Design a protein around this ligand. Structure first.
Ligand SMILES: [Mg+2]
Ligand SMILES: [Mg+2]
Ligand SMILES: [Mg+2]
Ligand SMILES: [Mg+2]
Ligand SMILES: [Zn+2]
Lengths: 154, 41, 128, 138, 157, 98, 96, 48, 180, 58
RNA sequence: AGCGGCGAGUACACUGUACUUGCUGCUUCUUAGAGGAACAUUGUGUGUCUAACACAAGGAAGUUUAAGGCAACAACAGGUCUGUGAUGUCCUUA
RNA sequence: UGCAUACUUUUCCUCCGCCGAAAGGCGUAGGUAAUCUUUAUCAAUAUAUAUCGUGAUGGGGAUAGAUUAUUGCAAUUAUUAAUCUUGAACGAGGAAUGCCUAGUAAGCAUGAUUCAUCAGAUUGUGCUGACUACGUCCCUGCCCUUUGUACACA
């Protein structure tokens, strides 16, 4: 599907050398297999952000979100909740008044982050700013990426 | 009007044309055969 | 069952379950989805392949959702004016409730009620 | 050894650091495998295809992009690559080869070497856009 | 503590205020200045804080107040300007002026460039509103100074 | 040392003068770095009234901040600063080790 | 119930009411509101069970109705029932 | 006396005490017409 | 090797008009792999002649306000159409497109009396007509745009008055004839 | 219906009250002074149908 | 403001790549001052072979390169005294 | 609840950490600014993969009903915001008429101005990037020479 004749070699080492959506999906699947992260209470009847005016329709969207968050963390040095919210923003059609940008429902994100920290994937750094990845977690992510790459090659 | 049904050279439009069907059903059929725009033979 | 009846006056024909459900005057989309989730029934299935038991269950869920897990802030008609419970009102019942409210307003001679009676806005809009 | 040039489309400066290496070619921290949309991918790969994939096994490339939207960014990247490879050739490889490469690029199209000079013209009062005025009913 | 932008604007405002104050005070003076009997002025400023066009305009206003034949005064002013080495001048006086309705009166001598950044540079302009019998007379004086060279000329040796 | 001002050419001249002063002796002077000119734009609508096809006018008070470094003693730097100067260029000296 | 509501504390009442009213209560009530309340109380005290007491002309339309002020008339005149409660004063000024 | 601290009628033009059309950016607080006249002295030059 | 869409090479293509060749340049420097060129095709009178035909088609497709300035989408649609052409009604899609273009131009037009049409103008008209027809087919149908467009293209290639553009052209020709 | 190729030699004058049309001289290989509606240059080839019937010069 | 320089690592490649903490030659990108560059230059047409235009090459650019800003003379009985402590008269002043 | 006295962060941008479905809240952190908000990315169109499937339809969000907040002395004639629900007109628009020639039209957003609060406005800025001229006086409006005039308030 993705593969093609390219004019260079790809150092498939870290997650930045992997296609995103597929990777996310894979991570979600892995999570599901594990049963490493829950699905709180309110998750199953909440709306992800003001602009969505409708539920997710993905069943295991939470897992996907978590995966995305991990990737984001890997990408940036130190990333807050506000930043995360901003990242997962969309257009809110206000019916008749024109669209505005809409900040995501941060609570769910926060919960996810908390869960991750409990599990030992993210790390609230006392120096600098809000919650980056923890080294072990990063390593795990890298491994997963590598695995994905291998699969794709196969 | 044309109330298409659900209960009973591959593309969805073609399928719709032929057996008079919803295109979700066409998609399903395609998937079955295999087992956001489409092309199949 | 191409064509169905879940409550007082519906259609719920060939459409995919959630949208069929939304035909009722708890036509929430989101609300419908939530209901479906509560039920635990595949939303990719159509309205015609549903069992009667399932339908009954859904109906039950719709009637007083507060005692079910489905949360408080969600519920259509928040405090119910009649100083008591918070419950989703559903179907012709909703309409009746609305009518009652209107009547009450009229009785009060609050400006909004008066406006409603007249057939003018209420909102604060202009229409000049 | 190592050569730094830029591309430029609209605002969107892609700075291509072209170094001695094995032939990987990257964007900020990501392979050119990604870029973003599958459709536009060819606009980045095209100079490489023109020059030949074997010629770039001596040359590593990193590209830092900043500013602009998507298509513009892609264009900038392309431009950087075009300027970059040629610049490298002019210094550390021969002149004849460089000339050949330039000729090839010219035959394909402009924009690879020389830049797109267009930029968003200031909006003017009495309207929403540059030229587009409001509306008179009389 | 106040930011740079905020500071600059404030300074500008202060300058403007000072100028206005000077204008208010010195009806009897050839005023231009703005660089810091006068004791009182100094005190006032402290309390607050914690050839030329303007002068000519002022003179004109004074003359008007005194009560001259207007045209004659304007002519005199023009002559004075010429003497002071001006390449060109222009005075306007619009207002009531003798008749009730209207009546703007131009008084040019030498050539007066109007358009371009040269205009902005190489003319001093000034505007005073002399209050009089039954309203206001409206001075505007415009002087073209000696250039540091005009963009139009191409002086071959 | 930070030199904030409104008038470009004057500022430039001042900078040049200070450079010259430095070049005398004893001063490891980093070159003048002009900062991002944060332009105060006011878009006012011309015309007191509401008559005429509402023309605006974009004014721009464009402040030039200029910056320059040294490794020195206070008195010497003060002396250097004394080029006479005037009300137009706003000077500030920072005498910090850090 | 109405009587029960009347009996119970102000905090409870605030909690019961819709959120705007609650917020207002939290903020305070100003010097005039208290006076108005007092006046209402006085009127109630003066009342006859057959026919309603004398009105109380009021300039301001901001007041939320609370079980203190049921049974009397206020301001043109408006009678205040227990059915109204947290629905503001008003009902004053517009034609057609 | 009634709260005159936050509203259009709270503050005014520095110059002529007018409550309407005040340039309130950068704490200038001059009603725009007045500003237009004194834009030269404040150091606001029209370039573009 | 030089190619388009990494698939249809246009070394195999043919033309047989002369005038049309002169007008539309699918050449040595008007080689292209994906339509999206940021070319300066409207800074001169005849610089639109250098423009590749695929690009032109994409531009044409791009029309109608709520879909305006969505180049990528248009490109995708055209790719899909090409694929369809390749698969069903098996031929080099480029050739088909060329044929359609050849067909499409009304050779004589009316004015305030009958006059002839320049080749470039005719080509432009054809491009417009094909896209407009496709759009019409799409609008409030179901079918899908790419499929419809493909169908239209095939019809044009054939030279058959079931599609809209061809019909329009015919009408124009008739009008011209009537005039003179 | 049968189109005949006429290579343009010179573009004479831009006619029509509103300015859309051009007068053109075209060689097959005979001189036929004809009208054109759209951008035309020297060397470009017209699609003439009704060949032997000319226009009026300016 | 960056780029490197380089320590310190964490992952994986081959016999370098991705990512953070700690220390401090280059100015391509980042900022912004002074300079430069296009003049229809060279080429070829059309033109009283005048002023000039069209095309081609070069070129970052060939419609004064694109965009503004500035705005003559004279008005309009145009608007604004509801911007002003610019301002006349008449009114109003417990 | 009132005054008086003492003393110190807060009045604007919000990082971040917690509570909150949401809005927002509480705690604290930097910033009088190329340092912090935040900008090697603050946006939406984009694109990719799913659900729909031409059915006033999940297009459309008017009108309405009932809360939870925030701003403010004060929110009803609902400031705005959020949550649930209500599912109207509209299937591309008649006579007319506006804007536009290259980073332009259009689409998409967004900063700033007003601002205690509130953009559907204006004003800037960008992002996606068409069509068609490359001319003409046919209309419309200006300008010019000639011509006619009993008009000059033209
Ligand atoms: Mg001049
Ligand atoms: Mg407005
Ligand atoms: Mg018109
Ligand atoms: Mg007469
Ligand atoms: Zn004022």
């Amino acid at each position: 599907r993705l593969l093609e004749p390219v004019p260079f070699v790809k150092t498939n080492n870290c997650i930045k050398d992997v296609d995103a959506d597929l990777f996310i999906r894979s991570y979600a699947t892995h999570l599901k297999l594990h049963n490493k992260i829950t699905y709180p209470k309110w998750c199953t009847f909440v709306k992800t952000g003001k602009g969505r005016k409708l539920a997710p329709l993905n069943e295991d969207w939470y897992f996907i979100r978590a995966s995305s968050i991990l990737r984001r963390l890997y990408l940036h040095p130190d990333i807050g909740v506000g930043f995360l919210r901003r990242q997962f923003s969309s257009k809110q059609r206000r019916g008749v008044a024109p669209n505005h940008t809409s900040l995501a429902s941060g609570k769910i994100l926060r919960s996810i982050l908390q869960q991750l920290e409990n599990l030992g994937y993210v790390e609230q750094n006392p120096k600098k700013k809000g919650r980056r990845l923890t080294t072990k977690g990063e390593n795990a992510i890298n491994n997963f990426a590598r695995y994905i790459n291998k699969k794709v090659y196969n | 009007k044309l109330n298409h049904a659900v209960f009973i050279v591959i593309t969805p439009s073609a399928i719709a044309e032929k057996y008079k069907v919803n295109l979700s059903v066409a998609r399903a059929v395609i998937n079955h055969l295999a087992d956001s725009q489409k092309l199949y033979t | 069952q191409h064509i169905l009846r879940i409550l007082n006056t519906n259609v719920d024909g060939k459409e995919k379950v959630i949208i069929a459900l939304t035909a009722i005057k708890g036509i929430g989309k989101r609300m419908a989805t939530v209901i479906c989730k509560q039920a635990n029934v595949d939303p990719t299935k159509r309205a015609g392949e549903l069992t009667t038991e399932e339908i009954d269950n859904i109906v039950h869920i719709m009637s007083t959702p507060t005692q079910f897990k489905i949360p408080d802030w969600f519920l259509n008609r928040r405090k119910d004016l009649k100083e008591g419970k918070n419950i989703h009102v559903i179907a012709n019942q909703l309409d009746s409730y609305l009518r009652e409210d209107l009547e009450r307003m009229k009785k009060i001679r609050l400006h909004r009620g008066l406006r409603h009676h007249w057939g003018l806005r209420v909102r604060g809009q202009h229409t000049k | 050894k190592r050569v730094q040039t830029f591309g430029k489309k609209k605002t969107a400066v892609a700075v291509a650091t072209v170094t001695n290496g094995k032939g990987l070619i990257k964007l900020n921290g990501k392979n050119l495998d990604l870029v973003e949309p599958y459709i536009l991918k060819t606009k980045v790969y095209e100079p490489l295809w023109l020059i030949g994939s074997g010629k770039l096994k001596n040359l590593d490339i990193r590209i830092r992009v900043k500013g602009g939207g998507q298509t513009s960014q892609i264009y900038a990247i392309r431009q950087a690559i075009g300027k970059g490879i040629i610049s490298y050739y002019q210094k550390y490889v021969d002149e004849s080869t460089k000339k050949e490469l330039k000729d090839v690029l010219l035959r394909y199209d402009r924009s690879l070497l020389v830049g797109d000079t267009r930029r968003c013209e200031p909006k003017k009062f009495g309207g929403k856009g540059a030229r587009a005025r409001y509306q008179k009913s009389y | 503590p106040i930011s740079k932008k905020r500071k600059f604007i404030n300074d500008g405002v202060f300058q403007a205020e000072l100028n206005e104050f000077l204008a208010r005070i010195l009806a009897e003076d050839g005023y231009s200045g703005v660089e810091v009997r006068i004791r009182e002025l100094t005190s006032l400023v402290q309390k607050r804080f914690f050839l030329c066009a303007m002068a000519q305009a002022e003179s004109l206003r004074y003359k008007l107040l005194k009560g001259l034949a207007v045209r004659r005064a304007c002519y005199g002013v023009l002559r004075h300007i010429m003497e002071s080495g001006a390449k060109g001048c222009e005075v306007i006086v619009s207002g009531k002026l003798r008749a009730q309705r209207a009546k703007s009166m131009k008084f040019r001598d030498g050539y007066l460039i109007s358009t371009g950044e040269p205009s902005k540079r190489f003319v001093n302009t000034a505007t005073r509103s002399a209050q009089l019998k039954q309203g206001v007379l409206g001075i505007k004086v415009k002087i073209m100074l000696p250039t540091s060279i005009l963009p139009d000329n191409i002086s071959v040796l | 040392i930070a030199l904030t001002s409104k008038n470009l050419r004057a500022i430039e001249k001042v900078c040049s003068d200070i450079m010259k002063g430095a070049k005398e002796k004893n001063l490891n002077v980093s070159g003048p770095v002009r900062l991002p000119v944060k332009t105060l734009r006011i878009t006012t609508r011309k015309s007191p009234c509401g008559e005429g096809t509402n023309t605006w006018d974009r004014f721009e008070l464009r402040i030039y901040k200029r910056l320059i470094d040294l490794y020195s003693q206070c008195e010497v730097v003060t002396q250097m600063t004394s080029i006479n100067i005037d009300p137009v260029v706003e000077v500030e000296v920072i005498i910090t080790d850090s | 119930d109405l009587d029960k509501l009347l009996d119970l504390s102000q905090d409870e009442l605030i909690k019961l009411f819709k959120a705007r009213q609650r917020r207002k209560f939290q903020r305070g009530i100003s010097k005039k509101a208290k006076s108005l309340l007092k006046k209402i109380r006085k009127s109630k005290k003066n009342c006859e069970p057959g026919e309603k007491p004398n009105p109380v002309p009021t300039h301001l339309r901001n007041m939320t109705i609370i079980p203190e002020m049921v049974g009397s008339i206020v301001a043109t005149n408006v009678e205040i029932k227990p059915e109204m409660i947290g629905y503001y004063l008003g009902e004053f000024s517009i034609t057609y | 006396v009634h709260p005159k601290k936050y509203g259009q009628g709270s503050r005014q033009c520095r110059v002529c005490s007018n409550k309407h059309a005040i340039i309130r950016k950068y704490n200038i607080n001059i009603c725009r017409q007045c500003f237009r006249e004194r834009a030269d002295i404040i150091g606001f030059k029209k370039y573009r | 090797d030089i190619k388009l869409f990494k698939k249809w090479s246009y070394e195999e293509i043919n033309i047989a008009d002369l005038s049309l060749v002169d007008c539309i340049a699918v050449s040595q420097k008007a080689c292209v792999y994906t339509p999206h060129t940021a070319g300066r095709y409207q800074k001169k009178r005849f610089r639109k002649a250098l423009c590749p035909i695929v690009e032109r088609l994409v531009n044409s497709m791009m029309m109608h306000g709520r879909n305006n300035g969505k180049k990528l989408k248009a490109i995708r649609i055209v790719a899909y159409a090409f694929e369809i052409i390749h698969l069903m009604t098996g031929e080099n899609p480029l050739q088909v497109f060329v044929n359609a273009v050849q067909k499409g131009g009304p050779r004589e037009d009316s004015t305030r009396q009958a006059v002839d049409v320049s080749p470039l103008r005719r080509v432009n008209q054809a491009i417009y007509l094909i896209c407009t027809g496709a759009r019409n087919a799409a609008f409030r149908n179901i079918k899908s745009i790419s499929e419809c467009l493909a169908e239209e293209i095939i019809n044009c290639a054939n030279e058959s008055s079931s599609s809209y553009a061809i019909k329009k052209k015919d009408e124009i020709e008739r009008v011209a004839k009537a005039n003179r | 219906e049968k189109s005949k190729l006429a290579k343009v030699e010179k573009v004479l004058g831009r006619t029509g009250s509103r300015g859309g049309v051009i007068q053109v001289r075209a060689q097959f290989g005979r001189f036929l002074i004809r009208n054109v509606k759209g951008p035309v240059r020297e060397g470009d080839i017209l699609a003439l149908l009704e060949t032997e019937r000319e226009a009026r010069r300016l």
